[PDB]
Design a protein around this ligand. Structure first.
Ligand SMILES: Nc1nc2c(ncn2[C@@H]2O[C@H](COP(=O)(O)OP(=O)(O)O)[C@@H](O)[C@H]2O)c(=O)[nH]1
Ligand SMILES: [Zn+2]
Length: 269
């Protein structure tokens, strides 16, 4: 009877947004069981009752999902990094992109605190952000002089989830969408933006050492012409990644972070 996105879950009641319209609903069939329980971000078919209430009959197949917090069908993961306080880190950024792609997410890169970054440092970060744009990511570098609402409404349509450490500047964006002014979705013009971040932790537990190269997008792309179909680009001969490194089309820090994570993600915790 109606199709929409779950924007709130409160003690087994699922609020479903239907183009602005809100419905408090409960699951039936499979969706009453824990192994099929609805999550915020689910697209659902529900039966309308009592004007603004309803029963969820179908939860559509999840295109993607985070477990902590539990949220499904993210259209863009915005990785939020400070330029300073703390200092921008390609080591932390590469790790967040690996996690992002391991969850099958679209990712883009947002650097904050430009207005208090030394201008010489701004040029070094700008050159780093160029390397990520050559890999295929959209990047922005913003400060207090920038319109945070204009920025969010230029983002691709659908569900945006901000992921990054506390203090990087997620709330400064999110407060523009808080009606009051465990995960809830807030409306924006072309979709939603999420209450919570996506990660930071031992979201490495599910990753096989063999998958790490798939989530370095330029290694994955250049590995197409390595001799070996599963070349790890470490000791293998005829390696196209090590060649592209040599002639300067893969950045050394990217290769070095791949190597550290390949060596680390193997290890017992
Ligand atoms: N100067 C400056 N400070 C910022 C910027 N973005 C965030 N902050 C500050 O950094 C701190 C953390 O911001 P907040 O949005 O609460 O971070 P969250 O923990 O990631 O949500 C706060 O004191 C913010 O006002 C920025 O672009 N420039
Ligand atoms: Zn290779």
């Amino acid at each position: 009877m109606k199709t929409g996105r779950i924007v709130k879950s409160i003690s087994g009641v699922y609020q479903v947004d239907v183009n602005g319209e809100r419905f408090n609903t409960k699951p039936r069939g499979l969706f009453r069981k824990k192994k099929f329980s609805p999550v915020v971000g689910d697209i659902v078919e529900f039966e309308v009752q009592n004007i603004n209430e309803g029963y969820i009959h179908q939860v559509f197949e999840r295109e993607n999902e985070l477990k902590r917090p539990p949220v499904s069908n993210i259209d863009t993961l915005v990785i939020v990094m400070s330029a300073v306080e703390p200092n921008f880190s390609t080591q932390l950024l590469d790790r967040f992109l690996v996690i992002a792609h391991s969850y099958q997410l679209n990712a883009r890169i947002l650097v904050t605190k430009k207005d208090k970054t030394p201008i010489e440092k701004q040029f070094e970060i700008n050159e780093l952000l160029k390397i990520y744009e050559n890999i295929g990511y959209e990047t922005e570098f913003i400060g207090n002089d920038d319109d945070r609402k204009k920025i969010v409404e230029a983002w691709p349509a659908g569900l945006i989830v901000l992921s990054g450490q506390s203090g990087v500047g997620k709330s400064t964006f999110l407060n523009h969408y808080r009606p009051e002014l465990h995960v809830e979705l807030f409306e924006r013009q072309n979709g939603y933006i999420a209450d919570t971040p996506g990660f930071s932790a031992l979201d490495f537990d599910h990753i096989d050492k063999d998958e790490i190269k798939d989530y370095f997008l330029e290694l994955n792309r250049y590995g197409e012409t390595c001799k070996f179909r599963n070349c790890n680009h470490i000791k293998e001969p005829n390696c196209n990644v090590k060649h592209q490194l040599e002639i300067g089309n893969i950045a050394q820090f990217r290769y070095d972070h791949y190597l550290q994570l390949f060596n680390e993600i193997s290890n017992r915790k």
